[PDB]
Amino acid sequence: FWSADITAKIEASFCQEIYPSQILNDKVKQGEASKQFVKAKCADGRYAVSFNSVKIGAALQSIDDWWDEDASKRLRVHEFGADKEIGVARRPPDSEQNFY
Amino acid sequence: TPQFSPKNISPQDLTHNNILTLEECYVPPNVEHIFCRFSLRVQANSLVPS
Amino acid sequence: ELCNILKYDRSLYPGKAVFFYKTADSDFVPLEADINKIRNNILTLEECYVPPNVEHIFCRFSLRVQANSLVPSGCSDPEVFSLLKELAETFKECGGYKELAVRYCRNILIGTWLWRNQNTGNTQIEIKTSKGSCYLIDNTRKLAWESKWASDDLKVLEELSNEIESALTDPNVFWSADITAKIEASFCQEIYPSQILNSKQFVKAKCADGRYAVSFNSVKIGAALQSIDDWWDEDASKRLRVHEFGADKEIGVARRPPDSEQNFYSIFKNTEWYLSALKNCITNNEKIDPAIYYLFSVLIKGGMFQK
Amino acid sequence: MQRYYFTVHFLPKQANLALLTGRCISIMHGFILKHNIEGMGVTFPAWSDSSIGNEIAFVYTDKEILNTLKDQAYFVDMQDCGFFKVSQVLAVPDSCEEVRFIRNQAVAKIFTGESRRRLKRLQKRALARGEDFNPKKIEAPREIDIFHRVAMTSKSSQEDYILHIQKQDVDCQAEPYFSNYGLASNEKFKGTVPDLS
RNA sequence: CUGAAAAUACAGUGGGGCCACUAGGGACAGGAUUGGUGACGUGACCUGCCGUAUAGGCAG
């Protein structure tokens, strides 16, 4: 039974902008804000701005650079090796490199 | 237009704005350090299919 | 020609610009607005002025600079990605980022970013960089874009432009600067921070102790630094905030309209043309085409442009 | 004893009410100073929480002097042009329905210029007395009830300013004692006017 | 200038009595929303007085 407590301490600039996880709003009413942030509600009642667990999970599993012998870029571990920057699958179903 | 031709709507409406209602997170003034903490558990689930 | 998912991340990251004053006991007293409410459908009228015994007021913000204008953040087309990469490299090696950096730097030194509070008193500007430099302007009120400066202010401009240009071109260099303006306030001088759109309320920054200090939006300081676009015509009356259609907010009509060939997208369709023009501009006293300066100023602004 | 009145109704929909209300009160003020009249009151029949109305009414005990005030140049001129609807001198229904319109000066403290003026004076006075000038700020935000603006020009000093008018409701009629704008200033003057609709 | 003219459906009224839905129970595995943004300067809220007073009252 193994568990780790991991803490980052960032020397912040004066009123520096923080970039947490954003909640989706395609269904938008113009009363309340469209672009929101993912929040962890504390016991006191206040809301701490936070990342999703899957967001953290996606970062740790950014290890896949086996899709070419000279590829330096690491993809998030996917069954088809999807690269959403350049917008192609690096392990297509046509090839022998996809998981299945 | 979809094939790059300018459609004719008012010259004054191009400099016109959109109202955006956003949430913003900034560090409070004269706070030197910010902290981000998560916990990681590791289980041996890749040996046998569930 | 143009891609599906072409997008750029901005290069200049300014913070919120907080207003404050220094007493004998404390060296950060936040400047608070006076809230008045009326009537329950309560209206809130807020007014902001310098407290009676305070003789200097301070506007402070941090500017950090990444090199996010060399390669696009996302792209579908590999040939476009390779083209833009080589274009950026060509523009860098020619030394146009220096000219952009100087214009960005000059706006910091003349106190543009102090919008309606600019030259209301004898403003001095202190700039402390991450590399342990410390620049001082002494009097903001004696400078201007078209004015010729003293050698001291030109040395400050040269050195800080070199630091910003190095930060804009090198991906392996992390660069930040802390910029404070000290303004000689008159007796209860009215101060003009940023307002909320929705009554009259001011953009506040909540301190650690709970008190709210009036400030400028980061976007507004940004809009000040990136007010360099005078390439739209030869005798340009003003410098526009860098926009893809050259939109002027005060007058309220575009100076680079979609019908014209001087809007961003018309210039972005001739990249392979401008690359050959830049490659000819290498080794050559020949000046760079202003369309490429406007192009790279939009790429330093960033965007999730077409489409 | 029987208080007579007339009413000036502003017909155009695009009319700036603070301007026209000021003009009507200034002409009344001028007339009062010229003829040496005491007890003249102003009432707003069409007073809402949204705004002051299109109607302003002048309440006094004498009928002839109200008829004299109805026959001023500006009123007949703006009635000829067709912007004004000026009523005849009618006796008040005299049943009940007393209100009090006050010029509340304290409203003027919500603006920066007033604080600057007030502190400059306090500084001079504190300096004159010989102590150190150190004023202390308030903790609670200033609470004011709904007020309406009447734009007023000092012809003596050529200075534009504003009357902050607030409506209060009273039970029964008090003595007719008002300011030179007929506007019962909430301590010095306690003059009530009949509520019209 | 009509498949033509004309036309009072009415009075009275007891649905009642009786009643057991029960037993048993795994929704489960995986997941990057992301790029970019100037609320105001054709505006009334001014200038003074009294007061120890950013209290509170006043003149145009």
Q: Tell me the three state secondary structure of residue C239.
A: coil
Distance set, CA C133 to CA C163, C167, D63 (Å): 10, 15, 84
Taking an 8 Å cut-off on Cβ atoms, the answer to whether A49 and B25 are in contact is: yes
Listed by number, the residues of chain D in 109-138 with a beta carbon closer than 8 Å to a beta carbon of chain C are 110-112, 115-116, 119-120, 123, 133-135, 137
Distance from residue B50 (CA) to nucleotide E23 (C1'), in Å?
Answer: 34
Query: Which positions on strand E lie below 7 Å from a protein C-beta?
Result: 29-41, 44-60
Q: Which of D59, D38, D42, D45 is nearest to D181 (CA)?
A: D42
Distance from CA of D39 to the nearest CA of C (A): 31
Q: Amino acid identity, residue C11?
A: S
A61 touching chain B per CB within 8 A = no
| Distance in angstroms (rounded) separating the CA atoms of residues A34 and A27 | 9
Looking at beta carbons, which residues of chain C come within 8 Å of B16?
252
Strand E contacted by D162 CB (< 7 A): yes
Residue of A nearest to B37 (CA): A7
Q: Which long-range contacts (CB under 8 A, 24 or more apart) does D115-119 make?
A: D115/C34, D115/C47, D115/C49, D115/C188, D116/C49, D116/C187, D116/C188, D119/C52, D119/C187, D119/C188
> Does chain D touch chain B (at least 3 C-beta pairs within 8 Å)?
no
Q: Which long-range contacts (CB under 8 A, 24 or more apart) does A25-34 make?
A: A30/B21, A32/B21, A33/B21, A33/B22, A33/B23, A34/B20, A34/B21, A34/B22
Residues 11-40 of D with CB under 7 A from strand E: 16, 18-19, 22
A97 CB-near residues (< 8 Å, 6+ apart): A67, A81, A90, A91
Taking an 8 Å cut-off on Cβ atoms, the answer to whether A33 and B42 are in contact is: no
**C7: which nucleotide lies closest, measuring CA to C1'?**
E35
Q: Which of C165, C158, C115, C119 is nearest to C140 (CA)?
A: C119
| Distance in angstroms (rounded) separating the CA atoms of residues C252 and D63 | 57
Taking an 8 Å cut-off on Cβ atoms, the answer to whether A12 and B29 are in contact is: no
B42 touching chain A per CB within 8 A = yes
Distance from CA of C36 to the nearest CA of D (A): 5
D63 CB-near residues (< 8 Å, 6+ apart): D4, D89
Distance from residue C63 (CA) to nucleotide E17 (C1'), in Å?
Answer: 92
Question: Looking at the DSSP assignment, which residues form a beta bridge with residue C65?
Answer: C12, C175
| Distance in angstroms (rounded) separating the CA atoms of residues D138 and C166 | 50
Q: Which two tokens stand for residue D29?
A: 């003020």
> Does chain A touch chain B (at least 3 C-beta pairs within 8 Å)?
yes
Q: CA dihedral in degrees (A78, A84, A88, A93; nearest 10)?
A: 20
Listed by number, the residues of chain B in 1-50 with a beta carbon closer than 8 Å to a beta carbon of chain C are 4, 6, 11-12, 14-16, 19, 26, 28-31
SS (H, E, C) chain D: CCCEEEEEEECCCCCCHHHHHHHHHHHHHHHHHHHCCCCCEEECCCCCCCCCCCEEEEEECCCHHHHHHHCCHHHHHHHHHCCEEECCCEECCCCCCEEEEEECHHHHHHCHHHHHHHHHHHHHHHHHHCCCCCCCCCCCCEEECCCEEEEEEECCCCEEEEEEEEEEECCCCCCCCCCCCCCCCCCCCCCCEECCC
Taking an 8 Å cut-off on Cβ atoms, the answer to whether A13 and C178 are in contact is: yes
Looking at beta carbons, which residues of chain C come within 8 Å of A15?
15-18, 61-62, 205, 215, 218
C90 CB-near residues (< 8 Å, 6+ apart): C275, C278, C279, C282
Looking at beta carbons, which residues of chain C come within 8 Å of A16?
15, 62, 64
Residue of C nearest to A32 (CA): C198
Give residue for tokens 């008190």: C211
C196 CB-near residues (< 8 Å, 6+ apart): C202, C203
Q: What resolution does the deposited structure have, in angstroms?
A: 2.6
